[PDB]
Every structure is written in structure tokens, then in C-alpha cells.
Amino acid sequence: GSRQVTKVDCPVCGVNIPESHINKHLDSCLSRE
Ligand SMILES: [Zn+2]
């Protein structure tokens, strides 16, 4: 994916993942941990 991609922390559970995977993680985490 060496083109354009950022990774950030999950405000709910505190994990680092790419922009697509993190948005989904924190969305599902806002419900369950
Ligand atoms: Zn999460």
C-alpha cells in the first residue's frame, strides 16, 4: 500500500490501524469495547 494511506489510534480500545480499518474498528468499538 505504498501510495497514500495513514494509520491512527482507536479512541475507544487504543489500537493503531490504517484509515479504513480504524474507522470501522472505533465505530464497532463504540458499541463493544
Ligand atoms: Zn478498536
- DSSP 8-state secondary structure symbol assigned to residue 33: -
Cα(6)–Cα(2) distance, rounded to whole angstroms? 10
Q: What does the domain layout of the chain look like in residue ranges? A: 1-33
Cell numbers at residue 15, please? 489500537
Q: Which listed CATH number (3.40.1620, 3.30.160, 3.30.1050, 3.20.16) goes with 1-33?
A: 3.30.160
* Cell numbers standing for residue 5: 494511506
> At which residue does the C-alpha cell 480499518 appear?
21
Residue 11 marked as a ligand binder: no
- Residue from 31, 32, 29 nearest 15 by CA: 29
Distance from C-alpha of 8 to C-alpha of 12, rounded to nearest angstrom: 12
What's the gap in Å between 25 CA and the centre of ligand 1?
A: 4
- Residue 32 per-residue DSSP state: -
Q: Give the amino acid at 24.
A: K
Residue 13 C-alpha cell reads as 480500545
- Sequence-distant (6+) residues with CB within 8 A of 26 are 10, 11, 12, 13
Residue 8: enclosing H or E segment and its boundaries?
strand 7-9
Q: How many Cβ atoms from other residues are within 10 Å of residue 10's Cβ?
A: 19
Method of determination is NMR
